[PDB]
């Protein structure tokens, strides 16, 4: 509010950019034409295993249809992502991740990545008790035009997204 918030006027996830887990700046317009799941991850949560395994399942099954997964580590929830980006990359490799890992970010507060600020105010990005990210492994499903079409909370295992994603290919 006192901060610059021209991010509010973006019309698509595809307008944004973010550093990948190796520190390289990626323009998210590469996802034009691809159904995407954007999620915040952490390594030291009780549901880390179920989330990583099922995200890998989704990518393995649907990458050929155009499914992409953008995983943003964050240490904002119980300090459950204390590692460096290199350590997080290695952790993801242990789950045979082949989707897109990003550098660690904040997802809540004034210093959150602006993509996350933007997703949280979208009509289909609404949370329950306000729009803040509540814990690790929130998921946003994004259509081929970069519009948010659904939000899933931490406790919704990634395979629940499988019911919805085929409508957007």
């Amino acid at each position: 509010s006192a901060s610059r918030d021209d991010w509010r006027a973006a019309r698509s996830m595809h307008e944004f950019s973010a550093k990948d887990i190796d520190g390289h700046m990626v323009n998210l317009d590469k996802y034009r034409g691809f159904v995407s799941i954007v999620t915040n991850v952490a390594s030291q949560c009780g549901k880390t295993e179920v989330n990583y395994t099922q995200l890998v399942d989704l990518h393995a099954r649907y990458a050929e249809r155009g499914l992409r997964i953008l995983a943003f580590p964050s240490n904002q929830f119980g300090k459950q992502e204390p590692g460096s980006n290199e350590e997080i990359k290695e952790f993801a490799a242990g789950y045979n991740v082949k989707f897109d890992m990003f550098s660690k970010i904040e997802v809540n507060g004034d210093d959150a990545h602006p993509l996350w600020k933007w997703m949280k105010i979208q009509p289909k990005g609404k949370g329950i008790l306000g729009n803040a990210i509540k814990w690790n492994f929130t998921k946003f499903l994004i259509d081929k035009n970069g519009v948010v079409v659904k939000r899933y909370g931490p406790m919704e295992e990634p395979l629940v997204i499988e019911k919805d994603l085929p409508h957007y290919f």
Binding site: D6, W7, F16
Partner: peptide, 13 residues
């Protein structure tokens, strides 16, 4: 740039 994050432009014109 419409939104900076750390040392890069997170939302280009």
């Amino acid at each position: 740039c419409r939104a900076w994050y750390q040392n890069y432009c997170a939302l280009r014109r």
